[PDB]
């Protein structure tokens, strides 16, 4: 088995959503935050040739940087991980599934109620800002034929009535009305251009961010409102 910079990147992201993770034979990876809010999945170029669980995904990936690029990763005679370098060998502990949290099956997102998109640059500005202005919540909504994102600080403004940031996305040719609230703490999306799919059905609200690499599924707050 081998892991390229690209794969190592997406995994490092996944590390921030969950410290651990369970790799399963194939060219598909997925994960989900322990608090059960975020779900991440992606298709990679590298083929995973053995099933193993990592307790500390981030630390493992950092050790990879300390060895060759073609280093071979494999299951060792003792059950742990063997990273074969050129003149050396690095060993890493194989975790016991019970000591980490992971999805049993991927998430099947429903057909979106609303579809829009957000460009790499806007997404980055959104995140950068939010930390500066202490934006703990954002609300995606339709205003005058357009989709905009309004950022608030729910602690002080529980009614999401006083916006600190405001980004205009795409046109909305629909005829519904909605105010989808997402907690910024769950926005652990890696940079890139994403297709945004918001879904509403009664109390059930969830958003799906999808790029050519990764896909994230995020549960939306109860504050949300929509007439779908």
């Amino acid at each position: 088995m081998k892991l390229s910079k690209d794969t190592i990147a997406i995994l490092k992201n996944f590390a921030s959503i969950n410290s651990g993770i369970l790799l399963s034979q194939g060219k598909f990876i997925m994960t989900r935050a322990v608090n059960g809010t975020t779900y991440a999945e992606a298709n990679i170029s590298d083929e995973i040739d053995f099933d193993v669980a990592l307790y500390d995904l981030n630390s493992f990936l950092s050790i990879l940087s300390l060895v060759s690029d073609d280093a071979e990763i494999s299951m060792h005679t003792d059950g742990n991980i063997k990273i074969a370098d050129t003149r050396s060998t690095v060993y890493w502990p194989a975790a016991d599934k019970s000591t980490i949290v992971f999805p049993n099956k991927p998430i099947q997102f429903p057909v979106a109620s609303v579809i829009t998109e957000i460009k790499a640059e806007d997404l980055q500005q959104l995140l950068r800002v939010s930390r500066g202005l202490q934006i703990d919540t954002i609300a995606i909504t339709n205003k005058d034929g357009k989709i905009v994102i309004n950022g608030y600080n729910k602690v002080e403004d529980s009614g999401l009535t006083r916006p600190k940031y405001s980004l205009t996305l795409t046109d909305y040719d629909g005829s519904n009305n909605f105010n989808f609230v997402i907690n910024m703490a769950n926005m652990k999306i890696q940079p890139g251009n994403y297709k945004v799919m918001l879904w509403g059905a009664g109390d059930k609200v969830a958003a799906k961010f999808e790029s050519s690499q990764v896909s994230y599924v995020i549960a939306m707050e109860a504050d949300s409102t929509h007439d779908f």
Binding site: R32, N35, G36, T37, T38, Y39, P103, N104, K105, P106, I107, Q108, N183, N186, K204, A206, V217, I218, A219, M220, E221, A222
Partner: peptide, 11 residues
């Protein structure tokens, strides 16, 4: 009120 995917999905 806790936003949780387990309130909508099977995984």
């Amino acid at each position: 009120k806790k936003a949780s995917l387990f309130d909508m999905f099977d995984f």
